[PDB]
Design an enzyme around this catalytic site. Structure first.
Site, short mmCIF file in Angstrom:
data_model
loop_
_atom_site.label_atom_id
_atom_site.label_comp_id
_atom_site.label_asym_id
_atom_site.label_seq_id
_atom_site.Cartn_x
_atom_site.Cartn_y
_atom_site.Cartn_z
N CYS A 25 3.33 -2.09 6.58
CA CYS A 25 3.33 -2.07 5.09
C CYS A 25 4.71 -1.96 4.42
CB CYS A 25 2.46 -0.92 4.58
SG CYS A 25 3.02 0.74 5.07
N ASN A 180 -0.58 -4.89 -3.01
CA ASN A 180 -0.77 -4.36 -1.65
C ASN A 180 -0.56 -5.49 -0.65
OD1 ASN A 180 -1.48 -2.74 0.57
ND2 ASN A 180 -3.41 -2.04 -0.29
C1 LIG Z 1 1.83 0.80 6.38
N1 LIG Z 1 0.79 0.07 6.70
C2 LIG Z 1 2.15 2.00 7.30
N2 LIG Z 1 2.91 3.00 6.54
C3 LIG Z 1 4.18 3.44 6.82
O1 LIG Z 1 4.81 3.02 7.77
C4 LIG Z 1 4.79 4.49 5.91
C5 LIG Z 1 5.29 3.86 4.59
C6 LIG Z 1 6.08 4.86 3.75
C7 LIG Z 1 5.50 6.07 3.38
C8 LIG Z 1 6.21 6.99 2.62
C9 LIG Z 1 7.51 6.70 2.22
C10 LIG Z 1 8.10 5.49 2.59
C11 LIG Z 1 9.49 5.26 2.17
N3 LIG Z 1 10.25 4.15 2.23
N4 LIG Z 1 11.37 4.51 1.75
C12 LIG Z 1 11.22 5.83 1.46
C13 LIG Z 1 12.21 6.84 0.89
N5 LIG Z 1 12.98 6.44 -0.30
O2 LIG Z 1 10.10 6.19 1.72
C14 LIG Z 1 7.39 4.56 3.36
N6 LIG Z 1 5.85 5.10 6.71
C15 LIG Z 1 5.88 6.43 7.01
O3 LIG Z 1 5.00 7.14 6.57
C16 LIG Z 1 7.00 6.94 7.84
C17 LIG Z 1 7.78 6.19 8.69
C18 LIG Z 1 8.70 7.05 9.24
C19 LIG Z 1 9.78 6.76 10.27
C20 LIG Z 1 9.99 5.27 10.59
C21 LIG Z 1 11.11 7.34 9.77
C22 LIG Z 1 9.44 7.50 11.56
N7 LIG Z 1 8.45 8.28 8.71
N8 LIG Z 1 7.49 8.21 7.90
C23 LIG Z 1 6.96 9.36 7.15
#
Ligand SMILES: *C(=N)CNC(=O)[C@H](Cc1cccc(-c2nnc(C=N)o2)c1)NC(=O)c1cc(C(C)(C)C)nn1C
Length: 213
Positions: A25, A180
């Site tokens: 996503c 989305n």
């Molecule tokens: C989509 N189908 C799957 N969702 C994800 O991968 C989410 C997307 C997400 C959630 C919350 C914040 C963000 C985001 N992008 N930029 C920023 C900050 N300015 O925030 C994106 N990803 C996660 O939940 C996710 C991924 C990671 C890593 C890659 C660092 C381990 N950590 N989190 C919490």
């Protein structure tokens, strides 16, 4: 900032796509934000490679189909000096080795911006800059089963957000216009009117950013 913004009526936005079963996503979210900022500067709308982000943005921190961040994707584009078009580098809902080729790059940026955490701040960014990458709490069958109307889930968080989408505008009671990546078959032709100016509903403001272009 006006009473309503639809960035689609002005050329900034491409069709709605489908991420498959891959948990990417963040690639879609991020190509959409880069899409309209590239439109802003060059005046040509071009579809960008979500696969390129998935295979190649590991070094910046993204875990491909296990997850990623929009911020890390823009930062890939910066560090690597480019993104490829979807023409050149088609989407296979799968993590594979990087097949980047600069001879086919069409977007770039100099980093990203993190919009202050406020809905007033979110409105103004959307109002001036283009569509913006955000992350909301989709974690409810309610969101999954959304067909139409002003989405507002009684038990939705403002702190934890699990899913990265795209605010392409807002309207009017009031709503955020959200693209989305679950195909045109989901919600309103792939879009969902998320509740606006209501105690940071589903965390839509909490983590908004966009590529520096
Ligand atoms: C989509 N189908 C799957 N969702 C994800 O991968 C989410 C997307 C997400 C959630 C919350 C914040 C963000 C985001 N992008 N930029 C920023 C900050 N300015 O925030 C994106 N990803 C996660 O939940 C996710 C991924 C990671 C890593 C890659 C660092 C381990 N950590 N989190 C919490």
């Amino acid at each position: 900032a006006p009473r309503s913004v639809d960035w689609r009526e002005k050329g900034y936005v491409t069709p709605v796509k489908n991420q498959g079963q891959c948990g990417s996503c963040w690639a879609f979210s991020a190509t959409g934000a880069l899409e309209g900022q590239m439109f802003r500067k060059t005046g040509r709308l071009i579809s960008l490679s979500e696969q390129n982000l998935v295979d190649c943005s590991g070094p910046q921190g993204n875990e491909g189909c296990n997850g990623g961040l929009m911020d890390y994707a823009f930062q890939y584009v910066q560090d690597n000096g480019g993104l490829d078009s979807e023409e050149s580098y088609p989407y296979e809902a799968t993590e594979e080795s990087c097949k980047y080729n600069p001879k086919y790059s069409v977007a770039n940026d100099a980093g990203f911006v993190d919009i202050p955490k406020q809905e007033k701040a979110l409105m103004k960014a959307v109002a001036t800059v283009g569509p913006i990458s955000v992350a909301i709490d989709a974690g409810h069958e309610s969101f999954l089963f959304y067909k139409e109307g002003i989405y507002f889930e009684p038990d939705c968080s403002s702190e934890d957000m699990d899913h990265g989408v795209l605010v392409v505008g807002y309207g009017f009671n009031k709503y955020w216009l959200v693209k989305n990546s679950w195909g045109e078959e989901w919600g309103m032709g792939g879009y969902v009117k998320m509740a606006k100016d209501r105690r940071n509903h589903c965390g839509i403001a909490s983590a908004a950013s966009y590529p520096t272009v």
